[PDB]
Ligand binder design. Structure first.
Ligand SMILES: Nc1ncnc2c1ncn2[C@@H]1O[C@H](COP(=O)(O)OP(=O)(O)OP(=O)(O)O)[C@@H](O)[C@H]1O
Ligand SMILES: Cc1c(C(=O)O)cc(-c2ccc(Cl)c(C#N)c2)c2cc[nH]c12
Ligand SMILES: [Mg+2]
Length: 262
């Protein structure tokens, strides 16, 4: 049972919609970690308390090199604090902003690390559902770490998340209230893969409705520089029908992955 007096807070690490994340030192052992701070009032106005509950419950029972550890939590009059493993190198979102695109070596390596973590998740029947770049964090060795388990759940599910926030990373089954499973994250791995090579996710549009349309009709094209190996993998992962999508096994053995990862 920890409290806020047990920590020294440093600078801010990020803003999510709900999370205000700060760097922290536990006073006792001098351990460096990150505190995700949530305001009771905004959770309660948005009615996302259940999401928090799932995040805490699911994320604490998971142990994997590529998954952000949740160490503990506690709360006070106005706030809830989650105690998290600190990720020194930022987010992939930021990496991507700095580089525009990633080469195949980097892309394929991130896809591997993702596939591993997902794999471990899925083996526990857990699905992330919110696998955007801003929730992919880098550890000290530049290894990728999955985070923000507020939208995670056990499979299968019907439950809506975002009323309409970013659809960019969501498969059709999801953007349409249908029962969906493990295959959801397979679709997102595809968006990510493509985004990583191109610098834009494949269904981006000026409006929500147009993106929605692009997504459900699976409308995307590749620019010229994208290699057949990549075209191939992205095409297998971005299938309308969830069950036509690869297994995590197949992705890792994919000739383009093995040719390019580390
Ligand atoms: N452990 C961490 N180490 C370093 N930076 C972090 C960490 N956690 C979060 N950040 C930074 O803060 C941002 C917001 O955090 P997070 O994604 O957990 O919040 P959220 O998006 O509000 O969560 P949720 O969708 O569950 O409500 C991250 O995208 C990243 O910029
Ligand atoms: C009113 C209130 C209380 C309470 O006073 O009892 C507690 C919480 C809450 C929710 C999740 C976690 Cl994990 C923790 C912790 N630790 C605390 C919340 C959330 C919105 N309102 C709340
Ligand atoms: Mg986030």
């Amino acid at each position: 049972q920890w409290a806020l007096e047990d920590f020294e807070i440093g600078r801010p690490l990020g803003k999510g919609k709900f999370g205000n994340v700060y760097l922290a030192r536990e006073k006792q052992s001098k351990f460096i970690l990150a505190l995700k701070v949530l305001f009771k009032a905004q959770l309660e106005k948005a009615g996302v308390e259940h999401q928090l509950r799932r995040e805490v419950e699911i994320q604490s029972h998971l142990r994997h090199p590529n998954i952000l550890r949740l160490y503990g939590y506690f709360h006070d009059a106005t706030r809830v604090y989650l105690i998290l493993e600190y990720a020194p190198l930022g987010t992939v979102y930021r990496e991507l902003q700095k580089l525009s695109k990633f080469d195949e070596q980097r892309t394929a390596t991130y896809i591997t690390e993702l596939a591993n973590a997902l794999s471990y998740c899925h083996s526990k029947r857990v699905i992330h559902r919110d696998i955007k770049p801003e929730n992919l964090l880098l550890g000290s060795a530049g290894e990728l770490k999955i985070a923000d388990f507020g939208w995670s759940v056990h499979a299968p599910s019907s439950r809506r998340t975002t009323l309409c926030g970013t659809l960019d990373y969501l498969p059709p089954e999801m953007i349409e209230g249908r029962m969906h499973d493990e295959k959801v994250d397979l679709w997102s791995l595809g968006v990510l893969c493509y985004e990583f090579l191109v610098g834009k996710p494949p269904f981006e549009a000026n409006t929500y409705q147009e993106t929605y349309k692009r997504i459900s009709r699976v409308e995307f094209t590749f620019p010229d520089f994208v290699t057949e190996g990549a075209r191939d993998l992205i095409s297998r992962l971005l299938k309308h029908n969830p069950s036509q999508r690869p297994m995590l096994r197949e992705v890792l053995e994919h000739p383009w992955i093995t040719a390019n990862s580390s």
